[PDB]
Amino acid sequence: TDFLTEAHLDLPMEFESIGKAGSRLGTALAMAVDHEINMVSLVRNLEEFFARESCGWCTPCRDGLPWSVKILRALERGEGQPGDIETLEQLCRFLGPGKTFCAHAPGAVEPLQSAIKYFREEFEAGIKQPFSNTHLINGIQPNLLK
């Protein structure tokens, strides 16, 4: 389910009440994350659980949850690069209800988009090195993309 802030704490636990709040009621067994626990590591652990316990039938969840897990691993170590958060948004948009075979993956990337929406400043702090996907090959001049 989606993460919520203190402004959403004063809101009754129903189905329709959480329906327009940008989250789900779920099993109604909430868990509170304090200031000491960084949300980057928490979302990394959540996506690692959702990736290692996915069923692996359909392509977007099966081959995109490891990509998000590796992006969050890079953001944990400060090895983030420009083009990671946008990759997370594109994966979440392409993992919605019916975009995958079932609803396990929309529930998997509900915490990711929630932590993006509410705690984007904690994810941008992991981006430190510029985007270097290729390595220099001696004898071939690279195509300087603009």
Partner: protein, 198 residues
């Protein structure tokens, strides 16, 4: 290891006749008169060789006759089109012995890139070639290298001195191939300059 034309034979060669034949071959190889024959782009590189920056004139091969009777070298530098193949054959027939043929470029070698309805696939289909030059176009110095190859081929062939005495058959030497001769140095090449440099 020679070749008879009127047969893989041996070296035919008084010791004065050998010196006379050597002097004749020296004079023939040091004065080679090509025939001015503009076929295609390979002729543009040929006349680039004839200019000042390369100076084929140094070898004594600058005269460039417009008449086939005076010339003794046919540089087929261009494509052998079907309409021009009888023209090339007639111009080769109008030449006088001794005469030598250099195919210049992939078109004259084998037809090259033009495996097409209107192109004869090589001038060796109808004309006996002496030296082949790969390239499209071969650079002017490649034409001069082929000229030197023709010179060293001429310098050891055996032709009759006079037409009233002696053996009238023409002996052409079977030269060792340039590929097998240069394989000893081409294979040993290890590093080349990278293409990013000037």
């Amino acid at each position: 290891d020679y070749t008879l034309t009127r047969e893989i034979v041996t070296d035919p060669l008084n010791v004065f006749m050998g010196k006379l034949n050597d002097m004749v071959n020296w004079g023939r190889k040091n004065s080679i008169w090509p025939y001015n024959f503009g076929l295609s782009c390979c002729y543009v590189e040929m006349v680039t060789s004839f200019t000042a920056v390369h100076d084929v004139a140094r070898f004594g091969a600058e005269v460039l006759r417009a008449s086939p009777r005076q010339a003794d070298l046919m540089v087929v530098a261009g494509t052998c089109f079907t309409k021009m193949a009888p023209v090339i054959q007639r111009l080769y027939d109008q030449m006088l012995e001794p005469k030598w043929v250099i195919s210049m470029g992939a078109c004259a070698n084998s037809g090259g890139m033009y495996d097409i309805y209107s192109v004869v696939q090589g001038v060796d289909k109808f004309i006996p070639v002496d030296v082949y030059i790969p390239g499209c176009p071969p650079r002017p110095e490649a034409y001069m290298q082929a000229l030197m190859l023709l010179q060293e081929s001429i310098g050891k062939e055996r032709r009759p001195l006079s037409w009233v005495v002696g053996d009238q058959g023409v002996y052409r030497a079977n030269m060792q191939s340039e590929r097998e001769r240069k394989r000893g140095e081409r294979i040993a090449v290890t590093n080349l300059r990278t293409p990013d440099e000037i």
